[PDB]
Write a protein that binds this ligand. Sequence first.
Ligand code: HEM
Ligand code: HEM
Ligand code: HEM
Ligand code: HEM
Ligand SMILES: N[C@@H](Cc1c[nH]c2cc(F)ccc12)C(=O)O
Ligand SMILES: N[C@@H](Cc1c[nH]c2cc(F)ccc12)C(=O)O
Ligand SMILES: [Mn+2]
Ligand SMILES: [Mn+2]
Ligand SMILES: [Mn+2]
Ligand SMILES: [Mn+2]
Lengths: 265, 269, 269, 265
Amino acid sequence: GRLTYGGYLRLDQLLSAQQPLSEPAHHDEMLFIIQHQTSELWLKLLAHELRAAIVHLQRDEVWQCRKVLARSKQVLRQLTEQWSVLETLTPSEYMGFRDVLGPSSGFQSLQYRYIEFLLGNKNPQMLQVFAYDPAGQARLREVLEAPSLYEEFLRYLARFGHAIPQQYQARDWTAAHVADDTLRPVFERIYENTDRYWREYSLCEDLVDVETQFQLWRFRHMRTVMRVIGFKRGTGGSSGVGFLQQALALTFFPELFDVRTSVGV
Amino acid sequence: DLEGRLTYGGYLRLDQLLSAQQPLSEPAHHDEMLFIIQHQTSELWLKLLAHELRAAIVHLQRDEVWQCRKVLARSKQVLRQLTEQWSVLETLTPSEYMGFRDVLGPSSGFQSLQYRYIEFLLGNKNPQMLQVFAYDPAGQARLREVLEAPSLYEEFLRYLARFGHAIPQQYQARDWTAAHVADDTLRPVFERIYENTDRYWREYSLCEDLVDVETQFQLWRFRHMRTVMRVIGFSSGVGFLQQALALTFFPELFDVRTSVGVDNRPPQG
Amino acid sequence: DLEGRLTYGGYLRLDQLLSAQQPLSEPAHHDEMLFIIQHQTSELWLKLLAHELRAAIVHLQRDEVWQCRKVLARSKQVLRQLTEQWSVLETLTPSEYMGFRDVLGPSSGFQSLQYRYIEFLLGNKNPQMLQVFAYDPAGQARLREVLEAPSLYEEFLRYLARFGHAIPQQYQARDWTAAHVADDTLRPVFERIYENTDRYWREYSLCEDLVDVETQFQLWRFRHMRTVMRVIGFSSGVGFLQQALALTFFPELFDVRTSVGVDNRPPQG
Amino acid sequence: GRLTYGGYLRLDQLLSAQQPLSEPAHHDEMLFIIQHQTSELWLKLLAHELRAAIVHLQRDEVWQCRKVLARSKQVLRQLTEQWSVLETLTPSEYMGFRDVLGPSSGFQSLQYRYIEFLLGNKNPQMLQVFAYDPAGQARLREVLEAPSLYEEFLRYLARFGHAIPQQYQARDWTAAHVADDTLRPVFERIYENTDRYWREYSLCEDLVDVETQFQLWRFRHMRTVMRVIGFKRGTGGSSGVGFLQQALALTFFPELFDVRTSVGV
Ligand code: HEM
Ligand code: HEM
Ligand code: HEM
Ligand code: HEM
Ligand SMILES: N[C@@H](Cc1c[nH]c2cc(F)ccc12)C(=O)O
Ligand SMILES: N[C@@H](Cc1c[nH]c2cc(F)ccc12)C(=O)O
Ligand SMILES: [Mn+2]
Ligand SMILES: [Mn+2]
Ligand SMILES: [Mn+2]
Ligand SMILES: [Mn+2]
C-alpha cells in the first residue's frame, strides 16, 4: 500500500520513468536522464518552499519566511552542486545520443519557468512553449498574474511604514519588475541602521543569498554546456552558450544590489 | 506531445515522475514534501550509481583501466551528491517532523532495493537480506544475481591476479554470496603496489580510487546517521547506523597503510 | 611598500605569512608542502572561528539574538571550510607520506592551542590540557581564561534563565572549569521550546543553530578521522579520533528529540 | 625547535600576521584578513603543484601529471568554496573599515598573478604593479618567459607525433597564447578516438576541469564583490564588478572548448 517503503515513495512509478531512447542503448544516457530528473524533483521542492515563503510574507511571519528561505537556499545549493556530476560527460559521449532528443530543451521545463516567474522574471511569451499543455500553461499564468516573491517583500515593507511607492499595492503583475530608483532610500535606511531594521535587513540578505545562488546555478549550467556542446546552436533554437551567458545578466532583485553603491556614502 | 515532436517532459517522463509525490498527512503537512523528495532524489542517484558501478565491473573484466577510473570518477561524484544533500534534510526540525511522522509506516531505507544493490556490488553481501524482498520476486531475483557474482573488489583482485600479482587461488572460484573476509595474505600484494608506483601506476591509481569510493560512502553513512540523530535522536535505530560505520568494503587497502615502507626509488630519491 | 602607500602584501603581512612554510625533508619532498599548508590554512580558520565564537558569546550576554545567529551563521561556514578542505589532504597517499613522515616530530593537532580554545569555548573543558601548554605561559593563560568562563552553551542556558525558562539555579554560579554534564532537568525546558515555536521562535532558532554547529563540528571530526585512516591507517592514534566522535557539546539539545510531542497548535493545525 | 607542532608549522610567525588597521578595531576585519590569507596559502600550494605538473609534462610523465592536476583541482575547489564565508560580510559591515585599505587591491597579489601567468594568461604590463618589489617582479618574469602549462601540453603532443605547429617548439612565450585554428584537427582526432588517445583525452579533460574551476572562482569572486560593494569603483582603480565580469571572458585553453563545436560532425 502506502505504508511500505516503496509504496509510500511510489517507487514503482518513480523508478520506471527512466527510458533512454538511444539504440543501441548508450551508457551515458542514463546519467543525462537522472541528472534532469533529480533536478526536477529539487525544483518541485523549491517551488513548494517558495510558495510558503510568499504566504509567510503576506502574513508578516518573518522567522517562518526566513526558515523556508533557508531550506530554499539549501535546495538551490544542491541544484548547483550537482553540475559536477554532469561534467563527467564528455563531448565524445554526448554526441552518441544527442540526436535522440530532437527539438526538446530546457525551455520546456514547466517547473523551472514557474520558479523564474515566482522570483519575478516574468515573460508572457514563455506561456506559448506550453501550448501543448493547457493545464500546465494555466498554472504558469496563475503565478504570472500574482505578485512575485520580491514584490510581496516590498508589500511587507509597505505594511510597516516604509516609503514604498503606491503602485506596489496594485498593478499589472504580469509585467516583469523594472528597477525602481525610488526604492534606493528605502534600502539605504535599512542597511544604515541594521539594529533597528534587523527584520528587514535579514530578509534583504536572504533574498541576496537566493539570487546569488540562482546565478551560480546559471553559471555552472552555462559552463557545463560549454564543455559539452561548446558553441553549437541549441536543440531549442537558441545560440546555446551565448544565450545562457545573457541569462546571467538578468536580475531578480536589482534594488538590493544597487543599494550597495550608495551604502555608507 | 508538442506537434508529434519529442518534448522535455515527454522524454524525461515528467508526468509520471512528478505525480509520485503523494503526502499522507491530512491536513497536509508542509514538511512532508521534503521527506519524500529527499528520499526520491536519493533513490534516483542510487539507480545511477548502480548503473555506473556495474560498468566499472565490466571494465575491470576487460582490463580497461582508464575506462574503469572514469566510471569510478563519476561514481564518486554521484556519492558526493548523495552525501551533500543531507544538508537539505538537516533543515527538518523535530517540531516539524512530529507533525507528520505518525502517518508514516515503520520502514526505513533499510527496505531500499537499490541501496542493497549498491552494498552487494561493493561487496557487503548478505543472503539474509533477500527475504525482506520476498514480497517482490522480480527485484529479489535481480538482487540475487549481484549476490552470486564477484563484487567490484573481487573483480579488482581477479584483475590483479591476471597480471602477476600474488593473489590467492581462492579468488578464482568460490561462493561469492559470502561477504569478503579480511585476507592478510593480500598485504604483501598491496605493499608491492604502493612501494613501486612507477611500475604499478595502474594498480596504484585503482587502489586510491577504491579508497576514495569507500571513504565517500562512509561519509554518506556518517551524514545519514548525524541527520537521523538531529531529527529523531538516539541492532536497530541510530545504534544500527552507528554500527554501519564500522563496516569496511576493502579492508586490505586500509590495512596496508600500517606496513608500507620499502623505498625502491632510484638515486637522488 | 608602494610609494608609502599601503599594499596588498603589506596589509596582509604576506612577507611574514608566506615565509612560514619550511619543509624539513632534504632532498625536499614534493608532498610536504601540502602537509604544512593543510595545517596552516586550518589554523587560520580556527583563529577566525574563535574570534567569531567569542562574539557569539558576547551577543548572548547582551540578549542580542539576531546578532548571535548571524555570527553563528558565519561560524558554521568557517567550520564547513575546515571540513571541506580534508578533500585536499585526501589526495595524499601512503606512498607519498612515507617519503617525508620520518622527518616530522611525534606531535599532532592535539597540540594546537587554537583548536583547544574552540573545544573549551564550545564546552568540552579539560583542565589537564593546560599542562601540554606549560612550555607557553602566555598561551596557557589565555586558554585558562576561556576554561574558567561559562561556555557558549552555558551562556545560552543563562540567557534562557533570564527569560523565564526553568533553568536550574546551579547555572547561575559554579566551577565552569568542569565540563558540562548531561542534565535531564533541562529536558522539559527544551520540550516547551520545541512544542511552541510560535512563542519561542528565538530560542527555537538558537537551539537549531547550536545543533548545526555541533553537527558540522562532528563532521569535521569524522572527515579528520577518515583522512588520517587512509593516510596512516588504524586512547591514542585513530582510536582516539574514533572516541572523539562520541563526545557531545550540547547533549540536552539532542536528547530532547526523543521526547518532544505536545501539540499546542490552534484549530486546523 | 622545528619538531614541535607549533615550531614545525612556524605558528609564532603565521599567527602573528593578522594585524587589523581599523581603529577602534572592527569585528569583521579579522574575517577580511583571514579570508585572503587562507586563499594566499592555497594559491601557494596551487603554484607548487602546477609547477610540478609542468615538469611531469616535459618528461612525458602522464599519470604523475594527472595526479598533481587532481590535487590542483581540489585546491581550486577550496578557493572557490570559501567565498561562502565572505558572503556573510554585508555592505554595512564592510564600509566600517574599507577606508583603511587605501589603494591596495587584488592586483597586487603576486601569487595570483604568478598562477595566471603559469596557466597562460600573460600580460607584461602587470610586472609594473610589482615595481616596488624587484625580487618578486623577477619571479613573475621567469614564468612569463617560459612556456605555459598549456603550451607544455602542446609540446607533449608534438613529441608524440601530433600535428603541432612548428612555432610551439620555440617562440616569444612572454606573449599570451592566441586561439590557433590549426589545432582544431589535432583535438578532433583525440576526441574522435578516445580509446586510442586515452592519454591525451585524459589530459584534455583535466585542463578543461582546471579552467572551469578557475572560472567558477572568478564568478564567485565577482558575485561576492557585487553583494559587498555593488557597482562602486574599486580601490585598485578599476570599475569593480564591470572589470571582474570582463575577466570571465578570458580563456586559458580556447582550442579545448572550441573543438566541442565540431566534435562528432
Ligand atoms: C548535456 C548537458 C546539457 C546541455 C548541452 C544543455 C544545453 C542547453 C542549451 C543549449 C540551452 C538553450 C536553449 C536551446 O537552444 O536549447 C539550455 C536551456 C535550459 N536548460 Fe540546459 N543543458 C544541459 C543540461 C541541463 C540540466 C541537467 C538542466 C536541469 C534540469 C538543464 C536546464 C535548462 C533550462 C531550465 C533552460 C531554460 C533557461 C532559460 O530559459 O533561461 N539543462 N540548455
Ligand atoms: C529524517 C528522516 C530519516 C530517518 C529518521 C531515518 C532513520 C533510519 C533508521 C533508524 C535506520 C536503521 C534501520 C532501521 O531501524 O530501520 C535507517 C536505515 C537506512 N536509511 Fe535512513 N532515515 C531517514 C531518511 C533517509 C533518507 C532520505 C534516505 C535516502 C534514501 C535513507 C536511507 C536509509 C538506508 C539506505 C538504510 C539502510 C542502511 C544500512 O542497511 O546500513 N534514510 N534509517
Ligand atoms: C595526514 C596527516 C595527519 C595525521 C596522520 C594526523 C593524525 C592525528 C592523530 C593520530 C591524532 C590523535 C591524537 C594523537 O595521537 O596525537 C590527531 C589529533 C588531532 N589532529 Fe590530526 N593528523 C593529520 C592532519 C591534521 C590536520 C591538517 C589538522 C588541522 C589543523 C589536524 C588536527 C588535529 C587536532 C585538532 C587533534 C586534536 C583532537 C582532539 O583532541 O580531539 N590534523 N591527529
Ligand atoms: C570584501 C571582499 C572583496 C571585495 C569588495 C573585492 C573587490 C575587488 C575589486 C573591486 C577588484 C578590481 C580591481 C580594483 O579596482 O580594485 C578586485 C580584484 C582582484 N581581487 Fe577581489 N575583493 C574582495 C575579496 C577578495 C579575496 C578574498 C580575494 C582572494 C585572495 C581576492 C582577490 C582578487 C584578485 C586576485 C584580483 C585581481 C584579478 C585580476 O587582475 O583579474 N579578492 N577585487
Ligand atoms: N538543449 C540541449 C538538449 C537538452 C539538454 N537538456 C535536455 C533535457 C531534455 F529532456 C531534452 C533535451 C535536453 C542541447 O542543445 O544539446
Ligand atoms: N579592491 C577592494 C579592496 C580589497 C579587496 N581585497 C583586498 C585585500 C587587500 F589586502 C587589500 C585591499 C583589498 C575594494 O575595492 O573594496
Ligand atoms: Mn611485507
Ligand atoms: Mn617508513
Ligand atoms: Mn516533559
Ligand atoms: Mn508525536
